[model samples]
Target: EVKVKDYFGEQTIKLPVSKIIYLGSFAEVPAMFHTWDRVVGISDYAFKSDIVKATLKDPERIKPMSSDHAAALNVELLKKLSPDLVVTFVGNPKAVEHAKKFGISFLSFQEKTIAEVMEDIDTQAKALEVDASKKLAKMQETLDFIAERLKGVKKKKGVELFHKANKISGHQALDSDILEKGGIDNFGLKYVKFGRADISVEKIVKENPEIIFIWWISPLSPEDVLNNPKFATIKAIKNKQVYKLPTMDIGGPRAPLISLFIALKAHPEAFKGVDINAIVKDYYKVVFDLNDAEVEPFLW
Candidate 1:
């Protein structure tokens, strides 16, 4: 049994996390990062063969939040599973309210950026009564390493990095500051919205970003960025400065680590004394219990 802190600032019983329902994939790592051995069931996307390999000690214990994405709650199904606490994101506020009606405690997490995501991990870890000091320490060390590496790093004037998610064309990129904080200046912040900000290729060309970090999602591979004629005229394309940011769980503690890795790559000068390999290795061991083999391919 575990005792953890709750929102009202009191410690509560955290044990008997037997049956669980994850509304999204972001919860998988935080749960594993905190209680890898204690999880019983997870949401569907959590166990994808590619990108993520999540498994509960008891697969039978894991089940879907709701068969319908538009709505969440098979009241009878939930009653049967009998989860101690049901975790979900802010996508469906109504669903959260309904869960409350059914006497199931629900926690809402917003996975917008790396920092916010990591903070949520702390919140969840506290709820599970998992000692996160070591994890925090290692992440802090990684952050410090990135900051030290980015001392006086430079970016082209008016340079921006845009992330293109699925079906998202010319979306104004938010969360670019995380990249800027890493060492390079992110031009997108002044012009784009926090969520998807759709812009034109002409707008991007006008910005003339020295480096662009695009996502590598399915069907829309890195090749798509290179093949697009309209995007070809962008300054980064002419100079061959495009980079692909691999999308795994861009949430939780892993988020910052990913941002730091991108910062180092986008602006190598920022990492003057940084041992990139060592930093990744330490983070893998501390966060995901990953081995050297696991960390190798992910590196720049």
Candidate 2:
């Protein structure tokens, strides 16, 4: 057994926590550490992801549970499965609370930042009794390499970039974090302090950021944002600086790649010969034992 404290506080996890019910998106972090075999249940979205299916030993056997994102807990279904433990994220703490009635241990934490994600990986590695110290060390080295590549890169921090979410009011802390890390300033922060926002369009136009990032979370496309009549006067739309952040850019073990991708976009000149693809392949091989044949296609 292993004892660790997540964002929620102290908890003891029996090693090799078999029959786990993962209710969050970042559950893939633990799975990357080779714990997928222990997962008997997962959220519907996770069950649909290509990487998740490819990583699992028996994907078909894994049960699907509707996540808090779509609806409330199906406590009756959870009771029947009798999961040994539950894995959730910061966004769905209430689900963790609901799981408490079933008397199951849970690790509910948010990993909006790269630091948090790495720490969670270490903690989960300990709980799963997996030797990931070397992997963690290599990942850190990879992150350091990425940082070095960004050195001396000219950034458009003053130009102001806004990350547009699917919903009118939606904003993601991770997106802001990535933008800042990539050396660009986020315009949304000036209007709201929370991770997600639904501020008025008038206020956004008033800010008049020079660059815009549209998250492809909805049917909204870069073309849609570029053509919108309301944004015709915006510098970003005029200069065609609007870009899309793919699913890979927002989360999971591929964060280093996300940072690099954003960093390159933020300042294209400095990353001319960085060979990001090569770095990504090397990173996955060291951290997750994934070969070039397996991970090359996932590079975005």
Candidate 3:
């Protein structure tokens, strides 16, 4: 048995975690560690997750997670699995309510930063009695790769503006840290202190960011930001430096790759001749033992 911190202070995880539901899609590395046999389910938020289906030992027996796009857990599915343990993201507090009702030992995590994400992986590693030191060290190397290359580059001011919403990444968000390592200052952090903090259009106009990085999930396109009458005077719009990133779980193993992507865009001269796609794809291969077909699901 493993004692872990949950929303309600503490809970004990049953040994081996034979029947577990990873409702937050936080089990990627554990599954990579040859532990997928124990993870009975996963969330749809993992993005193009058919790879989980193809890679698991018994795809036939694997089940869908109790939650999907919404953090709210699906009650009916909860009734069926009666999972011995359930690991979830704190964003989905509603799931904890049901976990308690069903006597499922539950663990939850907050993931606004990369350090915590790695720590959460450490927590999962303990639950499974597996050592992730080597894999994590490799990930640290990737982080070092980005930091080393950005050494002398001039930092650019930027903002990750969520489309059609008042949302912006701030000091409390992992994306802000990614942008920081990539040699960009998350300008919104000056005022928006929380992860995914709310902001008005006026502040955006006030900041006049030099670069605008849009999350891959955001429906707002570069053209959308450029075409906005209110943003006509912004530097990013004027210079056409606004870019939509490819989808990735930055809170998981993909953070370094995303940092590289940002560093490339923010300081292209520093990474001359570097094939961004090949670099990121190769790292994916190393972690997941991905085949040509499997790689696309984890990436695009």
Which candidate leads in TM-score? 2
* Residue pairs that clash (backbone atoms under 3 angstroms), model 3: none
lDDT of 3 by residue, 1-300 (tens): 877664467667778777777776464654466777676667755534433445665655657554443445566686687677677776646645655676676677767666677777777777878877766776777778878887877899888877563578887777888788778988778877776777888988998989888886678988888888989888988999988775666667666767778888878898886666676677777766677776775552
RMSD to the true structure for each prediction, in A, is 4.5, 3.2, 3.4
Best to worst by lDDT, what's the order? 3, 2, 1
lDDT of 1 by residue, 1-300 (tens): 444332223334456454455565364454345454444445555554222443244445456454233365656766776777665665556755665687665556655545555666676666566667787677667766666666665554334333442222222222454465555566555555554455555666676666666643334555666567777676666777766655545545565666685776677665667676777677767776666776666564
Top-scoring candidate (lDDT): 3
Off by over 4 Å in 2: 47-50, 69-71, 92-95, 152-154, 157-172, 249-251
lDDT of 2 by residue, 1-300 (tens): 788989788889876677777775564664577777677788766654555655776877878776555236657777778777776665656645655666778777676677777787777777777777887787678668767776776555322223443233223466666666666666666655656656666766776666666653445677887888887887777888877655542446666656676677767776777777777777767767887788876665
Off by over 4 Å in 1: 1-14, 28-45, 48-51, 54-80, 92-95, 111-113, 156-177, 216-219, 291-300
- Please give each candidate's TM-score: 0.76, 0.86, 0.83
Name the candidate, 1 or 2, with the larger lDDT value.
Answer: 2
Model 3 lDDT at residue 41: 67
Give candidate 3's TM-score.
0.83
TM-score of 1: 0.76
